[PDB]
Amino acid sequence: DKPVAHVVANPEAEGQLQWLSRRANALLANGVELTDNQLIVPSDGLYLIYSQVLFKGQGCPSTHVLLTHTISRFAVSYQTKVNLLSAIKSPCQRETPEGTEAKPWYEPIYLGGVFQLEKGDRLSAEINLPNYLDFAESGQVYFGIIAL
């Protein structure tokens, strides 16, 4: 029936965001393809597209870190890549004051919305700092689409 996918990050693929369809509560059906880490839609139509990432770090260093998460559309007809959904997070305000012990921080980001796509359009869900991802628990990093 509906083109659909819900793929999850490979917890073994450290330092990258490699999507898997091949897990206990993942899905990829009805014409959606996972090719070169992108979700490929099988037909023109409206799609709900969504993704979550979770970042974890230890303490706050001198360089101010900004975490980004973006879902982008490579429109096959126009050979162009456009951002559909995006967000930014700052885990730290100032450096961990020296002498004080660094505590782990956690930052989730969720993105989701409805978009008109064309057959063969390629969707990517990417982050700027993949090593910062946390895969320690299932359900924390995912990427999905639903044809409406």
Side-chain angles (χ1 to χ4, degrees):
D1 37 355
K2 289 177 162 71
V4 59
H6 178 92
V7 299
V8 306
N10 180 354
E12 306 305 315
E14 168 161 34
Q16 57 191 291
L17 187 31
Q18 173 183 65
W19 301 115
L20 305 181
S21 56
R22 281 282 95 231
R23 304 273 295 214
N25 294 283
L27 281 160
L28 171 81
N30 295 330
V32 185
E33 315 177 67
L34 180 57
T35 308
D36 302 319
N37 211 37
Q38 305 159 103
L39 291 171
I40 323 295
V41 298
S43 52
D44 300 354
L46 301 165
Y47 293 83
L48 174 61
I49 311 171
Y50 64 89
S51 179
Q52 168 177 310
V53 294
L54 181 66
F55 300 99
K56 182 200 170 179
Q58 293 288 348
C60 295
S62 296
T63 171
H64 186 62
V65 167
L66 301 178
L67 310 153
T68 70
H69 183 207
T70 302
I71 293 174
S72 65
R73 174 200 179 196
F74 186 85
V76 71
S77 304
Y78 325 107
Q79 293 307 301
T80 200
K81 175 160 157 168
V82 64
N83 293 349
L84 306 183
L85 305 157
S86 183
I88 310 171
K89 274 260 197 109
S90 48
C92 294
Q93 286 285 4
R94 205 187 47 174
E95 330 185 2
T96 295
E98 279 302 286
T100 72
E101 188 172 63
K103 302 308 231 295
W105 53 259
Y106 292 84
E107 298 289 4
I109 301 182
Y110 191 89
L111 307 163
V114 180
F115 298 90
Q116 64 279 46
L117 305 175
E118 296 177 26
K119 183 169 171 180
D121 280 356
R122 306 200 304 260
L123 304 176
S124 305
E126 316 167 324
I127 73 288
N128 58 339
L129 293 162
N131 284 82
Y132 279 98
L133 292 168
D134 185 288
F135 309 132
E137 290 297 284
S138 49
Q140 297 185 159
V141 184
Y142 51 83
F143 179 26
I145 69 172
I146 315 158
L148 306 175

